[PDB]
């Protein structure tokens, strides 16, 4: 997600610079018009008033398109990430015999995973429910799916935690630190 931030911040440098050419231009536009009648003083303002309206609109598409690509990029990984751990905390599973804390290592990376995909997903709709609200209110329904299915999918893994209940047993406190 560094590379995010520092996209992020990048966009807002040049969004900051565009829009101080911009004040200056308009600047120099008034001056370089004081000579001049007051419907052609009042069409400069207008026109200087719709530059920065278009440049805030071009900044409002490079954020969105900034963060549309980093969540697919992020869901990619995050996925991956998710799926090789299920593997080693359900081959740890299988293990003869079963290791409680080798278990219990690969059962955390895979709630961690979990939880990884879970915060950031809640994290960017909260952003966007704080900002714009009724645009929240569009995909509200998408991300409340995306999330119950894995709270859905953890819960199943975990579930399958008691299909070794000696080693359930020995972790289960451990496991409940993960949890809380």
Do not use: C
Request: hydrophobic share 40%.
């Amino acid at each position: 997600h560094a590379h995010f931030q520092k996209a992020k911040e990048r966009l807002e440098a040049k969004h900051r610079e565009r829009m101080s050419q911009v004040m200056r231009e308009w600047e120099e536009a008034e001056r370089q018009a004081k000579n001049l009648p007051k419907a052609d003083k009042k069409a400069v303002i207008q026109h200087f008033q719709e530059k920065v309206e278009s440049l805030e609109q071009e900044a409002a598409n490079e954020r969105q398109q900034l963060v549309e690509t980093h969540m697919a990029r992020v869901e990619a990984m995050l996925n991956d990430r998710r799926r090789l751990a299920l593997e080693n905390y359900i081959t740890a599973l299988q293990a003869v015999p079963p290791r409680p804390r080798h278990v219990f290592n690969m059962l955390k990376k895979y709630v961690r995973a979990e939880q990884k995909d879970r915060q950031h997903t809640l994290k960017h709709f909260e952003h966007v429910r704080m900002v714009d609200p009724k645009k929240a209110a569009q995909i509200r329904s998408q991300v409340m799916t995306h999330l119950r299915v894995i709270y859905e999918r953890m819960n199943q893994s975990l579930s399958l935690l008691y299909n070794v209940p000696a080693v359930a047993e020995e972790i289960q406190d451990e496991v409940d630190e993960l949890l809380q």
